[PDB]
Design a protein around this ligand. Structure first.
Ligand SMILES: *[C@@H]1O[C@H](CO)[C@@H](O[C@@H]2O[C@H](CO)[C@@H](O[C@@H]3O[C@H](CO[C@H]4O[C@H](CO)[C@@H](O)[C@H](O)[C@@H]4O)[C@@H](O)[C@H](O[C@H]4O[C@H](CO)[C@@H](O)[C@H](O)[C@@H]4O)[C@@H]3O)[C@H](O)[C@H]2NC(C)=O)[C@H](O)[C@H]1NC(C)=O
Ligand SMILES: *[C@@H]1O[C@H](CO)[C@@H](O[C@@H]2O[C@H](CO)[C@@H](O[C@@H]3O[C@H](CO[C@H]4O[C@H](CO)[C@@H](O)[C@H](O[C@H]5O[C@H](CO)[C@@H](O)[C@H](O)[C@@H]5O)[C@@H]4O)[C@@H](O)[C@H](O)[C@@H]3O)[C@H](O)[C@H]2NC(C)=O)[C@H](O)[C@H]1NC(C)=O
Ligand SMILES: *[C@@H]1O[C@H](CO)[C@@H](O[C@@H]2O[C@H](CO)[C@@H](O[C@@H]3O[C@H](CO)[C@@H](O)[C@H](O)[C@@H]3O)[C@H](O)[C@H]2NC(C)=O)[C@H](O)[C@H]1NC(C)=O
Ligand SMILES: CO[C@H]1[C@H](O)[C@@H](O)[C@@H](O[C@H]2[C@H](O[C@@H]3CO[C@@H](O)[C@H](O)[C@H]3O)OC[C@@H](O)[C@@H]2O)O[C@@H]1C(=O)O
Ligand SMILES: *[C@@H]1O[C@H](CO)[C@@H](O[C@@H]2O[C@H](CO)[C@@H](O)[C@H](O)[C@H]2NC(C)=O)[C@H](O)[C@H]1NC(C)=O
Ligand SMILES: *[C@@H]1O[C@H](CO)[C@@H](O[C@@H]2O[C@H](CO)[C@@H](O)[C@H](O)[C@H]2NC(C)=O)[C@H](O)[C@H]1NC(C)=O
Length: 456
């Protein structure tokens, strides 16, 4: 039989596990979803379903929340649980919990109500009084870190205790945090919340925080360091791997190494022994590209992001992919879903994320998938429950007729369902295809993404 394009999936060649997909709603953008700029109650629930319902939407499984460093909630600041200095590092801190966290607490409740497992809390900065520059903004260093003393003393343990208290407020209010980070883009010196550290400076604090959590009996997965690009994060990993005089490295305490895609993209594997996450990335150009899956390779096009995701898993070995803002009242590409007062416009970047997230569920494993032609790129995952999800990007200008072989399985696959994303389709379910001897034929449209989902 003639075969235009051959795709081979091998469930016996298995790679990294998957924790999931999602976004952030930091810097008060969570409040947008709850009607800050006029979103109706109908569309508040619609947006939450698009984001977090596996049946009605993308079923995102990770939410990245900001641990606020600010002493007010003006402009788009995230306010802190410890807005004012206790005076000295050993003084008893005064903590305030507002059951809100710039809208991120009710958002977390709503995501969890729809099944979201993972909440990643990440600080952009320690509160300013803990830092060398006495300012949450413009970088600066945690007082007491190697090379960075402060006249007010050593604030390292105070910052660790502060992060523990943020996590405790969440758990006591019924919303446990599962992943915890204490830096964002430590390379960056910017006008908003920021804080520095190289690899060895980050490692120093990782060990302090991990030992604090063990003393407190809190089970949580520690991350580092949300570097501004993939290569920039890779450069911190040697410092995280130095085994100190106590016989431990920071990597021993870490569960996930995290990085962003801005300064360099996740296109190669990081050299840690831990799982890695792409934890922030978007199109910050200011363009507005809601409807385009492919036109000319613009940074905000749907295919661009379908390919960013597929590459991050296949070539950069990540276990999760977290966009920047999910939904926001803007007309730029910074968020996946544009809100225009009481109007909801999910972009093709959203639908590309949804194609992956709806069918590649937590604890899935990536498996080998190859393509006979460079115009068709493939990825494949086997879920806990046996469902196999195969993502195919056809960048040809014509439809492509695929022969897809699933190899040896321990129970023959009998049906598979395609779900297509393109200039014409958001996430459109096609007719089921019969599978014979673990092989099936399928045509995919020009310039498109298709998720093929097997039935158990
Ligand atoms: C599928 O196959 C197609 C070809 O058929 C490939 O399409 C090309 O994709 C590349 C990106 O990979 C495109 O190049 C990029 O174009 C962006 C959009 O340009 C439009 O808008 C600008 C405004 O300046 C117009 O001038 C232009 O004519 C277009 O209308 C640019 O914004 C990009 O620039 C950015 O990246 C470059 C390179 O790093 C930087 O130098 C820039 O400063 C900026 O940061 C870039 O030039 C290209 O246009 C596409 N070609 C065609 C014919 O469409 C897809 O890449 C491929 N997809 C996959 C997944 O393989
Ligand atoms: C909740 O959010 C939704 C989604 O954003 C809001 O509904 C949109 O409201 C805006 C205005 O606020 C409308 O924008 C107008 O669109 C006109 C063109 O609309 C046609 O083309 C659309 C492109 O696909 C299409 O979706 C739309 O179909 C919808 O409306 C038809 C007419 O009532 C109806 O027959 C369909 O079944 C479907 O409901 C039209 O064919 C344009 O000419 C205007 O200038 C303006 O831009 C959107 O059309 C609305 N979209 C939908 C799907 O309703 C909604 O108001 C928000 N609030 C509530 C309470 O629901
Ligand atoms: C892709 O990422 C995965 C993580 O998602 C990497 O998996 C890691 O692989 C290393 C092997 O090089 C495992 O380390 C080994 O651990 C055992 C004990 O568990 C130890 O005895 C060995 O000496 C070695 O340290 C590590 O466990 C594993 N991590 C996970 C979370 O499974 C994988 O290596 C990455 N692939 C590439 C090409 O980088
Ligand atoms: C539509 O507004 C968006 C801004 O255009 C966009 O720059 C961004 O601004 C945020 C800023 O986000 C950072 C983007 O770069 C990343 O490297 C970094 O980790 C992010 O923190 O964060 C600080 C905040 O003050 C800015 O408003 O996102 C805006 C948005 O709401 O989407
Ligand atoms: C509240 O936070 C603001 C912002 O970090 C603090 O103001 C900064 O203070 C430093 C140190 O004096 C200055 O270098 C910056 O210029 C200030 N920034 C701004 C925007 O004013 C302020 O000190 C904090 N207040 C309290 C009581 O902690
Ligand atoms: C919230 O979104 C609305 C709708 O996009 C914004 O209002 C528009 O703003 C642009 C300029 O940025 C104007 O061209 C439109 O005429 C405005 N429309 C309306 C109905 O006012 C609004 O500015 C956004 N607000 C925030 C804080 O982001």
């Amino acid at each position: 039989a003639y075969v235009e394009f051959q795709i081979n999936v091998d469930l016996q060649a298995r790679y990294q596990s998957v924790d999931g997909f999602g976004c952030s709603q930091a810097f008060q953008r969570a409040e947008d979803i709850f009607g800050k700029y006029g979103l109706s109650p109908k569309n508040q629930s619609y947006v939450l379903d698009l984001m977090y319902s596996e049946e009605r939407g993308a079923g995102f499984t990770i939410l990245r929340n900001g641990i606020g460093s600010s002493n007010s909630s003006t402009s788009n600041l995230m306010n802190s649980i410890e807005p004012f200095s206790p005076g000295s590092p050993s003084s008893t801190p005064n903590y305030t919990w507002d059951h809100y966290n710039s809208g991120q607490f009710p958002l977390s409740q709503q995501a969890r109500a729809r099944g979201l497992p993972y909440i990643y809390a990440d600080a952009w900065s320690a509160p300013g009084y803990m830092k060398t520059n006495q300012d949450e903004n413009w970088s600066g260093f945690l007082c007491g870190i190697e090379g960075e003393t402060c006249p007010s003393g050593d604030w390292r343990q105070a910052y660790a205790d502060y992060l523990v208290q943020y996590v405790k407020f969440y758990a006591e209010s019924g919303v446990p945090v599962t992943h915890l980070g204490f830096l964002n883009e430590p390379q960056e010196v910017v006008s908003y919340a920021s804080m520095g550290s190289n690899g060895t400076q980050a490692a120093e604090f990782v060990k302090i925080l991990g030992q604090t959590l063990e003393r407190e009996g809190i089970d949580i997965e520690l991350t580092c360091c949300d570097g501004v690009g993939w290569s920039e994060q890779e450069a911190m990993i040697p410092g995280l791997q130095v085994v100190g005089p106590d016989g431990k490295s920071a990597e021993d305490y870490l569960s996930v190494v995290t990085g962003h895609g801005y300064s360099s993209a996740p296109t190669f594997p990081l050299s840690t022994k831990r799982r890695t996450w792409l934890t922030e990335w978007t199109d910050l150009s200011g363009a507005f590209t809601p409807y385009t899956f492919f036109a000319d390779g613009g940074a905000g096009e749907g295919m661009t992001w379908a390919n960013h995701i597929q590459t991050a898993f296949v070539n950069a070995n990540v276990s999760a992919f977290i966009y920047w803002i999910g939904a926001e009242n803007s007309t730029t590409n910074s968020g996946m879903i544009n809100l225009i007062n009481d109007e909801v416009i999910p972009s093709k970047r959203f639908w590309s994320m949804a194609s992956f997230s709806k069918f590649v569920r937590p604890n899935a494993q990536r498996v080998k998938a190859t393509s006979s032609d460079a115009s068709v790129t493939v990825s494949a995952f086997e879920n806990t429950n046996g469902v196999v999800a195969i993502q195919v990007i056809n960048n040809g200008t014509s439809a492509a007729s695929l022969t897809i072989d699933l190899g040896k399985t321990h129970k023959e696959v009998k049906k598979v369902v395609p779900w297509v994303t393109s200039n014409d389709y958001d996430l459109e379910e096609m007719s089921e295809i019969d599978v014979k001897h673990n092989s099936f034929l399928a045509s995919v449209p020009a310039r498109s993404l298709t998720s093929f989902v097997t039935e158990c």
